[model samples]
Target: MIRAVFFDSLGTLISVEGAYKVRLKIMEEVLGDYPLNPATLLDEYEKLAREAFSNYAGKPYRPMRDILEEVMRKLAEKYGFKYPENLREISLRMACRYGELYPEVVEVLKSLKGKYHVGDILQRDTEPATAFLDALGIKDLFDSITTSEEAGFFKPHPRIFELALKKAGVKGEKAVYVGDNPVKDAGGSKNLGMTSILLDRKGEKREFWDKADFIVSDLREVIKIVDELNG
Candidate 1:
């Protein structure tokens, strides 16, 4: 039986889709719209973030804001645009930019409260994430917030999942990890014997569907899954 449900923060719990667009609009302000594609910026941003985070040993707890700074510098160099002097501030502002929840996420989370242990597991730093959850008025709903920082590695790294399981005093086989990514979130959980839930908002079916116990497109659907598993 499942005793705990761990969720992914950015895409799974709180969505920054709209606010992320606003940040791009601001980017237009800084870069002066010289054939900049928002989609391309996002792709490049992901690459830079991945590279910067790969070296993060997590003792210093690298936040998304720090990665965003590197992204800004990389962007400036790539586009021949001057990197803004207020890059840090801009990065922080965007990083801390409060976000609204998915329409059913809160109600779904609330439904699961008191019945099963619920928490957010993050590959990024925890401070900003916890702050955002608090700002969204849903922080109290969570029983714990686990981060790769505490385990000195990112998700897909066994240390993080092992630490999370230890903190809950529950083995991986007894818990469920609900996340959007197939590999980092689901694959890792599966590797550790946790039930994997792929919250695929994009309707994506991964190459390794066997790793995910369930692939869901809606947040509310997760509740049903947990119930059945517990049942």
Candidate 2:
């Protein structure tokens, strides 16, 4: 029986469009008159950021904003674009802003409350994520908010999943995890023996179906999944 349901933030519970828009806006503003397309530049930025994070060791927690700054510097040097003077400020703004949750997130989360432990297993740092969740008016909905910063490891790393399971006081076999990414979320939790759901909004079934126990195109579908799992 499932006793806990954990979600991945940003692209899972929250829409990632806001961060993408902000990054694009910043790239456009800073790269003015530069011939490079902002979307391509933004894509490269994300790729580099992930590479930067992939190097995480037990080193002290570095926030996403810090990582973005490093990636921006790398991009500036590689592309010959003048790095914005306020790059720190811009990256900080991007990281601090929680943006919008998926339209059905609140309803789905609310429906899960009291029935099973609803918690967040996020890649974002705790402080800003908590503040944003509070500002977004859904912080109270989660029983726990496990962060990569706190866990010292990102999802797909069993340590983070173990921490989340510890908090819920349930073994991995008794919990469910829903995330947007196949490798990071579904594959991560699945390895820990938790039932995993891939929320594939893009209908990329062929790309991700095998990574999770279930594939859901909408957040509302979570309710039925939890019911069936707990039944």
Candidate 3:
């Protein structure tokens, strides 16, 4: 039976909304390059991130801000521009400043409030995650928020999951981890014997269908799943 629910904060529970203009604007201010193609910038961001995260056996945990700075440095070199001093601030602001909740996020979260302890198992840092949850006016909803820094490991590493389970005092089998990523979220949750629910809000058809115990297009579907598991 599920007694606790944990979610990947960024893509699962909440997301940065106005962050679209935020990055571009930052690029304009820092690199002094306006009307630049953010597509290539983001493409490089993904590429650099892949190189950083690929085959890394969970030894270090760096926030997206730091990771973003790394990408920004490469962009600076590629574009023959100077790396901005406020790059860290820009990335942190983009992550912790503004966000959008998925359509049914609040309603579904409220519905499951008292039935089970809802928590966040985040790969991000405590400071950014705190700002994110607080800024969205839902900080009080979670019973606990575990960061990769505190756990000394990121998702796909069982240390973080074990930490989350310990914080909730719920056995892994009795907790459900909800997230949109199959590579990290589902695999990590399943690694610790927790049920993984793939939050496919966009109906994303991706590989590794077998990783999650269930896949749903909406957050409301989570409530029914919880009820079924508990009943």
Question: Which model scores highest in lDDT?
Answer: 2
Write down the RMSD of candidate 2 (Cα, Å).
2.9
Candidate 2: clashing pairs of residues:
none
TM-score on alpha carbons, each prediction: 0.82, 0.84, 0.88
Model 2 agreement with the true structure over 60-150: per-residue lDDT tens digits: 4578767777789899999998878887555446545536777888888889987889888877767767776786778899999888887
Pairs that collide, model 1: none
Question: Which stretches of candidate 3 lie above 4 Å from their native place?
Answer: 15-25, 55-57, 62-64
lDDT of each: 0.72, 0.78, 0.75
Q: Is candidate 2 or candidate 3 better by lDDT?
A: 2
lDDT of 1 by residue, 46-158 (tens): 67777776665333445566677777788889977787787654533554563657788788878887788887787755666666677677779888777776777655667
lDDT of 3 by residue, 28-79 (tens): 5564554457666665666776787664546666665677677778877887
Candidates 1 and 3: which is better by TM-score? Answer: 3
Question: Which is better, 1 or 2, measured by lDDT?
Answer: 2
Candidates' RMSD to native:
3.2, 2.9, 2.4
